[PDB]
């Protein structure tokens, strides 16, 4: 526990630089100044029960917003169906993971407030109040099981156990019993306060989304950008106010040009204007460069070990085949133009060595297929 908590502390110490040159816009003070809210003074327990009632109202509206009575949230912030929910009704009554987090945190604050309420209304003494506070702060994982609601919260709860591990260790260090009588809740209380402070932006954003009324693409994106930009440039140059149909047929040549590049076959269209041909050449050179780049990049990704899909693998294989076919084409052309690379008299020397070795072996060379053969 000590080693793990020291790890957490040192990781906190590593990344510590605030860029936050804020304008000191006190949003809370502005909300206080808003006419929709007013200020007063009241006891902390009264504020706690007010917040519990407000959270229950929040969950009540969030649940029965679509007039669905399938799911019911109890006053203890535990959701429960009113009957054996139908599978279609179960699909209808479903909430996201962040809603699970919100319900869990509301449950935690409600149970803390109710514990202080029962303490104030006599019942159990204050020593046990502190002990129960300590336990709840260091057993939220067991109490609420945030694991499913959020995986990261597990870290908080597990470290809370670690701090509690130390707290009880020291509390029960000597004459103090080895029982559950430990009361140092602040150590986990601060951690839970920090984690809640980190979480609350998400809950606020989602609650605002509900309160409002609006509650593999990179290669495809670049291809669409290329084709759309070229089409828009053509429609700017080509007077759509006069000619309409032929522009669509223009796209055909685009595709033709593209496949004319893929097949590595000559492409000449005398009917098309020369500036149009130049624009097509620029488009096809950009597309070919991008296509080869992404082809070799995806091939490298596949061979490295990255997981790929069947269609993506087939497309990458096709692109690699096309690229290799092209490359072999200019390689053969370069061999034809530059001639054989066998140096003069060097292949002759190799042949002389071979024939000398064969003569040393002194074997009869294989003749033409005879009329009569053994088998």
């Amino acid at each position: 526990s000590y080693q793990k908590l020291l790890k957490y502390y040192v990781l906190n110490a590593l990344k510590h630089r605030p860029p936050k040159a804020q304008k000191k816009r006190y949003l809370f003070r502005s909300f206080k100044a808003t006419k929709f809210f007013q200020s007063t003074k009241l006891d902390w327990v009264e504020v706690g029960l007010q917040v519990c009632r407000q959270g229950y109202n929040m969950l009540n509206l969030l649940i029965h917003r679509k007039n669905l009575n399938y799911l019911h949230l109890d006053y203890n912030f535990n959701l429960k169906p009113v009957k054996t929910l139908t599978t279609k009704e179960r699909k209808k009554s479903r909430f996201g993971n962040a809603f699970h987090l919100c319900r869990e945190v509301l449950r935690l604050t409600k149970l803390v407030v109710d514990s202080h309420v029962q303490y104030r209304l006599g019942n159990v003494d204050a020593f046990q109040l502190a002990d129960g506070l300590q336990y709840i702060f260091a057993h939220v994982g067991q109490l609420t099981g945030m694991y499913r609601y959020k995986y990261k919260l597990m870290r908080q709860i597990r470290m809370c156990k670690d701090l509690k591990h130390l707290i009880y260790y020291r509390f029960n260090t000597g004459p103090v019993g080895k029982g559950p009588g430990c009361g140092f809740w602040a150590a986990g209380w601060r951690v839970w306060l920090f984690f809640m402070r980190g979480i609350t932006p998400l809950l606020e954003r989602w609650l605002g989304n509900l309160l409002a009324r609006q509650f593999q693409r990179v290669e495809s994106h670049f291809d669409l950008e290329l084709r759309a930009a070229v089409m828009h440039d053509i429609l700017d140059m080509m007077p759509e106010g006069i000619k309409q149909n032929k522009a669509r047929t223009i796209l055909q040549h685009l595709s033709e040009a593209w496949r004319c590049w893929k097949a590595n076959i000559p492409w000449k269209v005398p009917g098309l204007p020369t500036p149009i041909e130049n624009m097509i050449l620029r488009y096809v050179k950009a597309k070919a460069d991008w296509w080869t780049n992404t082809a070799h990049y995806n091939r490298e990704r596949i061979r490295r070990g990255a997981t790929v899909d069947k269609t993506v693998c087939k497309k990458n294989l096709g692109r690699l085949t096309r690229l290799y076919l092209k490359a072999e084409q200019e390689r053969q052309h370069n061999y034809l133009k530059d001639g054989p690379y066998i140096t003069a008299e060097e292949a002759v020397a190799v042949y002389t060595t071979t024939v000398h070795w064969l003569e040393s072996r002194r074997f009869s060379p294989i003749p033409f297929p005879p009329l009569s053969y053994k088998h």
């Binding site: 917003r65 605002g208 509650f215 930009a229 700017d236 149009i276 530059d338 054989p340 002759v348």
Partner: protein, 133 residues
């Protein structure tokens, strides 16, 4: 029926006779209110204005730096579209709707001929050289 006006006075959702595809709750939304919405939006804007200026300046600087490395798609052919209008009207009108350097192979042929001649000359030393008929 593309290109037709929509007769007003009828709700498209109700007239078609469709059923509410309730995929999942809490996934869809399902004047004093206007004034409250305006006030809350103003409060949200006030809260967000704490870091807006510096973030916007940094984003603008980053975008400007990114543009130099690689500009927009239409930027690579801005000159071409500038010169695109130079084509005559009759040029694109008749667009077909249907879809020096000597013989470098001479050096290769000479090299191949020289190699073949050298091999044929070396074939004389091959006492056991054989052919077919």
């Amino acid at each position: 029926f593309l290109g037709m006006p929509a007769p007003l006075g009828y709700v498209p959702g109700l007239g078609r006779g469709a059923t509410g595809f309730t995929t999942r709750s809490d996934i869809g939304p399902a004047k004093d209110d206007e004034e409250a919405d305006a006030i809350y939006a103003a409060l949200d804007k006030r809260m967000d204005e704490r870091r807006k200026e510096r973030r916007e300046q940094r984003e603008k600087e980053e975008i400007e730096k990114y543009r130099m490395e690689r500009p927009k798609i239409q930027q690579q052919f801005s000159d071409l579209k500038r010169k695109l209008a130079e084509v005559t009207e009759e040029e694109w009108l008749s667009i077909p709707e249907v879809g020096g350097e000597l013989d470098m192979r001479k050096i290769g042929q000479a090299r191949n001929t020289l190699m073949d001649m050298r091999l044929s000359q070396v074939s004389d030393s091959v006492s056991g050289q054989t052919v077919v008929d």
